[PDB]
Amino acid sequence: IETAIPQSEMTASATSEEGQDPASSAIDGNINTMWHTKWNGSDALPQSLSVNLGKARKVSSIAITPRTSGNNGFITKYEIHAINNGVETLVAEGTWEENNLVKTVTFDSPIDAEEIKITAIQGVGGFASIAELNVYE
Ligand SMILES: OC[C@H]1O[C@@H](O)[C@H](O)[C@@H](O)[C@H]1O
Ligand SMILES: [Ca+2]
């Protein structure tokens, strides 16, 4: 048993976004639209995407769907922080491969969080992109 938090209950924000690729496009249920930092490369990494969850949640996993086409912004090095009451705390970090496969992060002990922040430390082309982000309880 695991349950998907409705993305419609989420709101998204990013420190860098191309006009065509806003933070909100990371949570619209469409793998053809992405969040992407600004194409002109002016916002050097790290850049981040914050997703507010709507209420206090107990999250057991996160699925990070890369762009369905192209490679620019495949995140290769990341951090994940959670915001709860309203303390911010580092909860995941590592390296991801250079491909378009969904990247999962699982919490054996489910974490309390009202908001999650994905920080892209390194990414291809010096960009960060996420086509879809889902959060599971
Ligand atoms: O300049 C950066 C841009 O490059 C394009 O080729 C790509 O389709 C966009 O997603 C964006 O990454
Ligand atoms: Ca999307």
Side-chain angles (χ1 to χ4, degrees), residues 6 15-16 21-22 26 49 62 71 73-75 81 120-121 128 135-136:
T15 56
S16 182
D21 302 336
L49 165 77
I62 299 152
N71 65 177
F74 279 171
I75 304 169
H81 295 76
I121 303 164
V135 192
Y136 298 86

mmCIF file with all atom_site columns, all heavy atoms in Angstrom, residues 6 15-16 21-22 26 49 62 71 73-75 81 120-121 128 135-136:
data_model
loop_
_atom_site.group_PDB
_atom_site.id
_atom_site.type_symbol
_atom_site.label_atom_id
_atom_site.label_alt_id
_atom_site.label_comp_id
_atom_site.label_asym_id
_atom_site.label_entity_id
_atom_site.label_seq_id
_atom_site.pdbx_PDB_ins_code
_atom_site.Cartn_x
_atom_site.Cartn_y
_atom_site.Cartn_z
_atom_site.occupancy
_atom_site.B_iso_or_equiv
_atom_site.pdbx_formal_charge
_atom_site.auth_seq_id
_atom_site.auth_comp_id
_atom_site.auth_asym_id
_atom_site.auth_atom_id
_atom_site.pdbx_PDB_model_num
ATOM 1   N N   . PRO A 1 6   ? -2.359 14.048 -4.612  1.00 0.00 ? 6   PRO A N   1
ATOM 2   C CA  . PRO A 1 6   ? -2.817 14.761 -5.795  1.00 0.00 ? 6   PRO A CA  1
ATOM 3   C C   . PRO A 1 6   ? -1.955 15.999 -6.036  1.00 0.00 ? 6   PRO A C   1
ATOM 4   O O   . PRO A 1 6   ? -1.716 16.784 -5.109  1.00 0.00 ? 6   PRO A O   1
ATOM 5   C CB  . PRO A 1 6   ? -4.251 15.161 -5.434  1.00 0.00 ? 6   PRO A CB  1
ATOM 6   C CG  . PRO A 1 6   ? -4.662 14.198 -4.374  1.00 0.00 ? 6   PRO A CG  1
ATOM 7   C CD  . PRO A 1 6   ? -3.424 13.906 -3.605  1.00 0.00 ? 6   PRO A CD  1
ATOM 8   N N   . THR A 1 15  ? 13.772 28.770 -8.176  1.00 0.00 ? 15  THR A N   1
ATOM 9   C CA  . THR A 1 15  ? 14.692 29.894 -8.058  1.00 0.00 ? 15  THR A CA  1
ATOM 10  C C   . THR A 1 15  ? 15.134 30.370 -9.446  1.00 0.00 ? 15  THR A C   1
ATOM 11  O O   . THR A 1 15  ? 15.634 31.495 -9.603  1.00 0.00 ? 15  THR A O   1
ATOM 12  C CB  . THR A 1 15  ? 15.935 29.506 -7.229  1.00 0.00 ? 15  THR A CB  1
ATOM 13  O OG1 . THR A 1 15  ? 16.563 28.356 -7.815  1.00 0.00 ? 15  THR A OG1 1
ATOM 14  C CG2 . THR A 1 15  ? 15.551 29.194 -5.793  1.00 0.00 ? 15  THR A CG2 1
ATOM 15  N N   . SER A 1 16  ? 14.956 29.489 -10.434 1.00 0.00 ? 16  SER A N   1
ATOM 16  C CA  . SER A 1 16  ? 15.216 29.780 -11.844 1.00 0.00 ? 16  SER A CA  1
ATOM 17  C C   . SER A 1 16  ? 14.228 29.021 -12.713 1.00 0.00 ? 16  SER A C   1
ATOM 18  O O   . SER A 1 16  ? 14.019 27.813 -12.524 1.00 0.00 ? 16  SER A O   1
ATOM 19  C CB  . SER A 1 16  ? 16.631 29.384 -12.237 1.00 0.00 ? 16  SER A CB  1
ATOM 20  O OG  . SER A 1 16  ? 16.872 29.716 -13.595 1.00 0.00 ? 16  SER A OG  1
ATOM 21  N N   . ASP A 1 21  ? 9.030  27.130 -19.411 1.00 0.00 ? 21  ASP A N   1
ATOM 22  C CA  . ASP A 1 21  ? 9.164  25.999 -18.494 1.00 0.00 ? 21  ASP A CA  1
ATOM 23  C C   . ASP A 1 21  ? 9.066  26.418 -17.027 1.00 0.00 ? 21  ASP A C   1
ATOM 24  O O   . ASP A 1 21  ? 10.069 26.376 -16.309 1.00 0.00 ? 21  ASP A O   1
ATOM 25  C CB  . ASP A 1 21  ? 10.514 25.310 -18.723 1.00 0.00 ? 21  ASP A CB  1
ATOM 26  C CG  . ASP A 1 21  ? 10.691 24.819 -20.143 1.00 0.00 ? 21  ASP A CG  1
ATOM 27  O OD1 . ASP A 1 21  ? 9.675  24.584 -20.824 1.00 0.00 ? 21  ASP A OD1 1
ATOM 28  O OD2 . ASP A 1 21  ? 11.849 24.661 -20.575 1.00 0.00 ? 21  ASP A OD2 1
ATOM 29  N N   . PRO A 1 22  ? 7.866  26.831 -16.571 1.00 0.00 ? 22  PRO A N   1
ATOM 30  C CA  . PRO A 1 22  ? 7.736  27.277 -15.179 1.00 0.00 ? 22  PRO A CA  1
ATOM 31  C C   . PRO A 1 22  ? 7.720  26.110 -14.183 1.00 0.00 ? 22  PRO A C   1
ATOM 32  O O   . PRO A 1 22  ? 7.480  24.969 -14.572 1.00 0.00 ? 22  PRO A O   1
ATOM 33  C CB  . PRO A 1 22  ? 6.381  27.983 -15.167 1.00 0.00 ? 22  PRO A CB  1
ATOM 34  C CG  . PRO A 1 22  ? 5.593  27.288 -16.227 1.00 0.00 ? 22  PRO A CG  1
ATOM 35  C CD  . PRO A 1 22  ? 6.581  26.893 -17.292 1.00 0.00 ? 22  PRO A CD  1
ATOM 36  N N   . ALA A 1 26  ? 6.153  21.202 -13.603 1.00 0.00 ? 26  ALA A N   1
ATOM 37  C CA  . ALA A 1 26  ? 6.706  20.002 -12.977 1.00 0.00 ? 26  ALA A CA  1
ATOM 38  C C   . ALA A 1 26  ? 5.626  19.167 -12.289 1.00 0.00 ? 26  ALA A C   1
ATOM 39  O O   . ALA A 1 26  ? 5.842  17.988 -12.000 1.00 0.00 ? 26  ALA A O   1
ATOM 40  C CB  . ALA A 1 26  ? 7.796  20.375 -11.988 1.00 0.00 ? 26  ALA A CB  1
ATOM 41  N N   . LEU A 1 49  ? 13.854 23.539 -6.995  1.00 0.00 ? 49  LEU A N   1
ATOM 42  C CA  . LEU A 1 49  ? 12.412 23.557 -7.195  1.00 0.00 ? 49  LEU A CA  1
ATOM 43  C C   . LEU A 1 49  ? 11.771 23.187 -5.869  1.00 0.00 ? 49  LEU A C   1
ATOM 44  O O   . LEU A 1 49  ? 12.075 22.137 -5.301  1.00 0.00 ? 49  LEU A O   1
ATOM 45  C CB  . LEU A 1 49  ? 11.997 22.563 -8.286  1.00 0.00 ? 49  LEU A CB  1
ATOM 46  C CG  . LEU A 1 49  ? 10.517 22.169 -8.434  1.00 0.00 ? 49  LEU A CG  1
ATOM 47  C CD1 . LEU A 1 49  ? 9.702  23.250 -9.119  1.00 0.00 ? 49  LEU A CD1 1
ATOM 48  C CD2 . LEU A 1 49  ? 10.368 20.842 -9.182  1.00 0.00 ? 49  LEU A CD2 1
ATOM 49  N N   . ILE A 1 62  ? 9.451  9.667  -3.432  1.00 0.00 ? 62  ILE A N   1
ATOM 50  C CA  . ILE A 1 62  ? 9.358  10.752 -4.416  1.00 0.00 ? 62  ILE A CA  1
ATOM 51  C C   . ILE A 1 62  ? 9.843  10.224 -5.772  1.00 0.00 ? 62  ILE A C   1
ATOM 52  O O   . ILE A 1 62  ? 10.917 9.625  -5.856  1.00 0.00 ? 62  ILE A O   1
ATOM 53  C CB  . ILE A 1 62  ? 10.194 11.993 -3.978  1.00 0.00 ? 62  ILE A CB  1
ATOM 54  C CG1 . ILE A 1 62  ? 9.682  12.547 -2.640  1.00 0.00 ? 62  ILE A CG1 1
ATOM 55  C CG2 . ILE A 1 62  ? 10.159 13.087 -5.042  1.00 0.00 ? 62  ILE A CG2 1
ATOM 56  C CD1 . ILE A 1 62  ? 10.732 13.244 -1.813  1.00 0.00 ? 62  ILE A CD1 1
ATOM 57  N N   . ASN A 1 71  ? 18.399 15.998 -23.467 1.00 0.00 ? 71  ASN A N   1
ATOM 58  C CA  . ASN A 1 71  ? 19.116 15.697 -22.216 1.00 0.00 ? 71  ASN A CA  1
ATOM 59  C C   . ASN A 1 71  ? 19.440 16.889 -21.294 1.00 0.00 ? 71  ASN A C   1
ATOM 60  O O   . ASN A 1 71  ? 19.792 16.700 -20.128 1.00 0.00 ? 71  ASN A O   1
ATOM 61  C CB  . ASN A 1 71  ? 20.351 14.807 -22.466 1.00 0.00 ? 71  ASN A CB  1
ATOM 62  C CG  . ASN A 1 71  ? 21.435 15.485 -23.294 1.00 0.00 ? 71  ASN A CG  1
ATOM 63  O OD1 . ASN A 1 71  ? 22.501 14.898 -23.520 1.00 0.00 ? 71  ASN A OD1 1
ATOM 64  N ND2 . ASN A 1 71  ? 21.181 16.711 -23.750 1.00 0.00 ? 71  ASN A ND2 1
ATOM 65  N N   . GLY A 1 73  ? 19.651 19.480 -18.642 1.00 0.00 ? 73  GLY A N   1
ATOM 66  C CA  . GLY A 1 73  ? 19.083 19.590 -17.304 1.00 0.00 ? 73  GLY A CA  1
ATOM 67  C C   . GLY A 1 73  ? 18.824 18.284 -16.577 1.00 0.00 ? 73  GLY A C   1
ATOM 68  O O   . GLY A 1 73  ? 18.239 18.294 -15.493 1.00 0.00 ? 73  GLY A O   1
ATOM 69  N N   . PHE A 1 74  ? 19.231 17.158 -17.169 1.00 0.00 ? 74  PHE A N   1
ATOM 70  C CA  . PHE A 1 74  ? 19.262 15.901 -16.438 1.00 0.00 ? 74  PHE A CA  1
ATOM 71  C C   . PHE A 1 74  ? 20.065 16.225 -15.182 1.00 0.00 ? 74  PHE A C   1
ATOM 72  O O   . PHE A 1 74  ? 21.245 16.567 -15.275 1.00 0.00 ? 74  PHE A O   1
ATOM 73  C CB  . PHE A 1 74  ? 19.985 14.790 -17.224 1.00 0.00 ? 74  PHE A CB  1
ATOM 74  C CG  . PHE A 1 74  ? 19.148 14.101 -18.282 1.00 0.00 ? 74  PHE A CG  1
ATOM 75  C CD1 . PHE A 1 74  ? 19.752 13.211 -19.168 1.00 0.00 ? 74  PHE A CD1 1
ATOM 76  C CD2 . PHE A 1 74  ? 17.785 14.327 -18.401 1.00 0.00 ? 74  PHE A CD2 1
ATOM 77  C CE1 . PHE A 1 74  ? 19.008 12.551 -20.159 1.00 0.00 ? 74  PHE A CE1 1
ATOM 78  C CE2 . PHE A 1 74  ? 17.034 13.671 -19.386 1.00 0.00 ? 74  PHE A CE2 1
ATOM 79  C CZ  . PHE A 1 74  ? 17.649 12.781 -20.264 1.00 0.00 ? 74  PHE A CZ  1
ATOM 80  N N   . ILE A 1 75  ? 19.426 16.160 -14.018 1.00 0.00 ? 75  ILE A N   1
ATOM 81  C CA  . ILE A 1 75  ? 20.120 16.434 -12.763 1.00 0.00 ? 75  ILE A CA  1
ATOM 82  C C   . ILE A 1 75  ? 20.995 15.238 -12.400 1.00 0.00 ? 75  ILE A C   1
ATOM 83  O O   . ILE A 1 75  ? 20.510 14.104 -12.359 1.00 0.00 ? 75  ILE A O   1
ATOM 84  C CB  . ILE A 1 75  ? 19.133 16.774 -11.613 1.00 0.00 ? 75  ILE A CB  1
ATOM 85  C CG1 . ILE A 1 75  ? 18.246 17.964 -12.020 1.00 0.00 ? 75  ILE A CG1 1
ATOM 86  C CG2 . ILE A 1 75  ? 19.906 17.050 -10.314 1.00 0.00 ? 75  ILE A CG2 1
ATOM 87  C CD1 . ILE A 1 75  ? 17.070 18.240 -11.109 1.00 0.00 ? 75  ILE A CD1 1
ATOM 88  N N   . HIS A 1 81  ? 15.466 18.483 0.667   1.00 0.00 ? 81  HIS A N   1
ATOM 89  C CA  . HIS A 1 81  ? 15.143 18.990 1.999   1.00 0.00 ? 81  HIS A CA  1
ATOM 90  C C   . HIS A 1 81  ? 13.645 18.958 2.171   1.00 0.00 ? 81  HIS A C   1
ATOM 91  O O   . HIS A 1 81  ? 12.902 19.147 1.205   1.00 0.00 ? 81  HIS A O   1
ATOM 92  C CB  . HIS A 1 81  ? 15.595 20.442 2.181   1.00 0.00 ? 81  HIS A CB  1
ATOM 93  C CG  . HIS A 1 81  ? 17.075 20.642 2.128   1.00 0.00 ? 81  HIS A CG  1
ATOM 94  N ND1 . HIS A 1 81  ? 17.785 20.624 0.946   1.00 0.00 ? 81  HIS A ND1 1
ATOM 95  C CD2 . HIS A 1 81  ? 17.975 20.904 3.106   1.00 0.00 ? 81  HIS A CD2 1
ATOM 96  C CE1 . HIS A 1 81  ? 19.061 20.859 1.200   1.00 0.00 ? 81  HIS A CE1 1
ATOM 97  N NE2 . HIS A 1 81  ? 19.205 21.027 2.503   1.00 0.00 ? 81  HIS A NE2 1
ATOM 98  N N   . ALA A 1 120 ? 19.290 21.105 -7.504  1.00 0.00 ? 120 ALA A N   1
ATOM 99  C CA  . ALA A 1 120 ? 20.176 20.579 -8.529  1.00 0.00 ? 120 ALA A CA  1
ATOM 100 C C   . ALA A 1 120 ? 21.561 21.202 -8.390  1.00 0.00 ? 120 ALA A C   1
ATOM 101 O O   . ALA A 1 120 ? 21.757 22.374 -8.711  1.00 0.00 ? 120 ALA A O   1
ATOM 102 C CB  . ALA A 1 120 ? 19.603 20.845 -9.898  1.00 0.00 ? 120 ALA A CB  1
ATOM 103 N N   . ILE A 1 121 ? 22.512 20.415 -7.895  1.00 0.00 ? 121 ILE A N   1
ATOM 104 C CA  . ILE A 1 121 ? 23.900 20.868 -7.733  1.00 0.00 ? 121 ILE A CA  1
ATOM 105 C C   . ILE A 1 121 ? 24.637 20.807 -9.068  1.00 0.00 ? 121 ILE A C   1
ATOM 106 O O   . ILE A 1 121 ? 25.385 21.723 -9.418  1.00 0.00 ? 121 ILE A O   1
ATOM 107 C CB  . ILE A 1 121 ? 24.657 20.027 -6.678  1.00 0.00 ? 121 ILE A CB  1
ATOM 108 C CG1 . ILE A 1 121 ? 23.929 20.075 -5.328  1.00 0.00 ? 121 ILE A CG1 1
ATOM 109 C CG2 . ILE A 1 121 ? 26.109 20.501 -6.542  1.00 0.00 ? 121 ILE A CG2 1
ATOM 110 C CD1 . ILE A 1 121 ? 24.361 18.990 -4.350  1.00 0.00 ? 121 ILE A CD1 1
ATOM 111 N N   . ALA A 1 128 ? 18.919 22.513 -15.074 1.00 0.00 ? 128 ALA A N   1
ATOM 112 C CA  . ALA A 1 128 ? 18.120 21.581 -14.299 1.00 0.00 ? 128 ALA A CA  1
ATOM 113 C C   . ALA A 1 128 ? 16.738 21.539 -14.933 1.00 0.00 ? 128 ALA A C   1
ATOM 114 O O   . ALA A 1 128 ? 16.154 22.597 -15.218 1.00 0.00 ? 128 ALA A O   1
ATOM 115 C CB  . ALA A 1 128 ? 18.025 22.037 -12.843 1.00 0.00 ? 128 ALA A CB  1
ATOM 116 N N   . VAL A 1 135 ? 4.690  12.704 -5.276  1.00 0.00 ? 135 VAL A N   1
ATOM 117 C CA  . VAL A 1 135 ? 5.029  12.460 -3.875  1.00 0.00 ? 135 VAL A CA  1
ATOM 118 C C   . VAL A 1 135 ? 4.065  11.431 -3.324  1.00 0.00 ? 135 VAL A C   1
ATOM 119 O O   . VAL A 1 135 ? 2.852  11.538 -3.507  1.00 0.00 ? 135 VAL A O   1
ATOM 120 C CB  . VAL A 1 135 ? 5.013  13.752 -3.012  1.00 0.00 ? 135 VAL A CB  1
ATOM 121 C CG1 . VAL A 1 135 ? 5.647  13.492 -1.649  1.00 0.00 ? 135 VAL A CG1 1
ATOM 122 C CG2 . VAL A 1 135 ? 5.766  14.886 -3.708  1.00 0.00 ? 135 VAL A CG2 1
ATOM 123 N N   . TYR A 1 136 ? 4.614  10.420 -2.670  1.00 0.00 ? 136 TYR A N   1
ATOM 124 C CA  . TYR A 1 136 ? 3.803  9.297  -2.249  1.00 0.00 ? 136 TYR A CA  1
ATOM 125 C C   . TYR A 1 136 ? 3.774  9.186  -0.743  1.00 0.00 ? 136 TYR A C   1
ATOM 126 O O   . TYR A 1 136 ? 4.773  9.469  -0.079  1.00 0.00 ? 136 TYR A O   1
ATOM 127 C CB  . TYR A 1 136 ? 4.308  8.014  -2.911  1.00 0.00 ? 136 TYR A CB  1
ATOM 128 C CG  . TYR A 1 136 ? 4.209  8.076  -4.414  1.00 0.00 ? 136 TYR A CG  1
ATOM 129 C CD1 . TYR A 1 136 ? 5.236  8.638  -5.179  1.00 0.00 ? 136 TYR A CD1 1
ATOM 130 C CD2 . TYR A 1 136 ? 3.075  7.609  -5.073  1.00 0.00 ? 136 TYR A CD2 1
ATOM 131 C CE1 . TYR A 1 136 ? 5.141  8.710  -6.556  1.00 0.00 ? 136 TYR A CE1 1
ATOM 132 C CE2 . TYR A 1 136 ? 2.972  7.677  -6.455  1.00 0.00 ? 136 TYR A CE2 1
ATOM 133 C CZ  . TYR A 1 136 ? 4.005  8.232  -7.187  1.00 0.00 ? 136 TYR A CZ  1
ATOM 134 O OH  . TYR A 1 136 ? 3.906  8.306  -8.552  1.00 0.00 ? 136 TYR A OH  1
#
